[PDB]
């Protein structure tokens, strides 16, 4: 979906010329009445790599943050500001953990995503190492709700759709674990 909108960046600078788009900044920070939070600094690829571990660790707060939006009855942004900081702090907690426990396993995976069009199907060898590491050092697991355990896609031993080109760092790191761990 690459539809033009009035809410973000469009396809070309010729769209901007027709719309006479002004990219407007607002220097004003938030008022002191709202206690500050440390915003998450991860980019697209690290978030998609750690998305299922944020789901495993912040599940209660994410559900509660959304349930505040459902029951705010249209005043969601203003009446869920405190519950929206727990989620930001919880997610920052996970990315800080992966940087201090599985820095190389994490970086290898989201370098693969940045190498393969941000698709999970192309990075199973790196992803399997990261999941195995996270389990032993943080107990988090990746689970896809709504299906039996035996039929999750990322555990599929012989997938139908496989990457066209291999990630060298993934294949090298994988076979090393075939010696370090598969004793």
């Amino acid at each position: 979906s690459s539809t033009h909108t009035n809410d973000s960046l469009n396809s070309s600078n010729y769209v901007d010329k027709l719309k006479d788009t002004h990219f407007v900044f607002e220097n004003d920070k938030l008022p002191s009445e709202i206690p500050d939070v440390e915003e998450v600094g991860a980019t697209t690829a690290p978030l998609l790599s750690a998305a299922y571990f944020i789901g495993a660790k912040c599940q209660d707060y994410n559900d509660d943050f959304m349930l505040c939006q459902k029951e705010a009855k249209g005043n969601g942004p203003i009446d869920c500001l405190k519950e929206g900081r727990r989620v930001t702090r919880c997610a920052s907690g996970v990315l800080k953990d992966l940087n201090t426990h599985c820095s190389d396993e994490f970086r290898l995976h989201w370098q693969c995503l940045s190498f393969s069009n941000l698709e999970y199907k192309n990075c199973r060898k790196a992803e399997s190492l990261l999941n195995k590491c996270v389990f032993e050092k943080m107990n988090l697991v990746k689970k896809i709700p709504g299906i039996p355990e035996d039929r999750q896609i990322h555990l599929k031993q012989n997938p139908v759709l496989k990457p066209v080109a291999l990630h060298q760092d993934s294949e090298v790191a994988f076979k090393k674990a075939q010696n370090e761990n598969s004793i």
Partner: protein
């Protein structure tokens, strides 16, 4: 300016030129609908526009068929 009916000067002197003006006139209606639908982020307006383009095509085909048979009706000696 158009209140003096300027668009009558802009339409040619053949029956086929009238047919084109009808299409250019309807084209303005569809462009107006696409404009509103995209601003409102409403796909119902885009359903309307899709219907207008399809219905405006059927109108052209019937009109040309009448015009075509109108033309051959004069050239209908065919006694060779």
């Amino acid at each position: 300016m158009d209140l003096i009916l300027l668009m009558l000067v802009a339409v040619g002197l053949n029956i086929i030129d009238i047919y084109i003006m009808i299409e250019i006139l309807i084209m303005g209606c569809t462009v107006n609908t696409i404009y509103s639908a995209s601003l409102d982020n409403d796909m119902i307006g885009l359903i309307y526009s899709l219907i207008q383009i399809i219905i405006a095509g059927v109108e052209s085909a019937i009109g040309l068929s009448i015009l075509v048979n109108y033309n051959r009706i004069r050239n209908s000696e065919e006694i060779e």
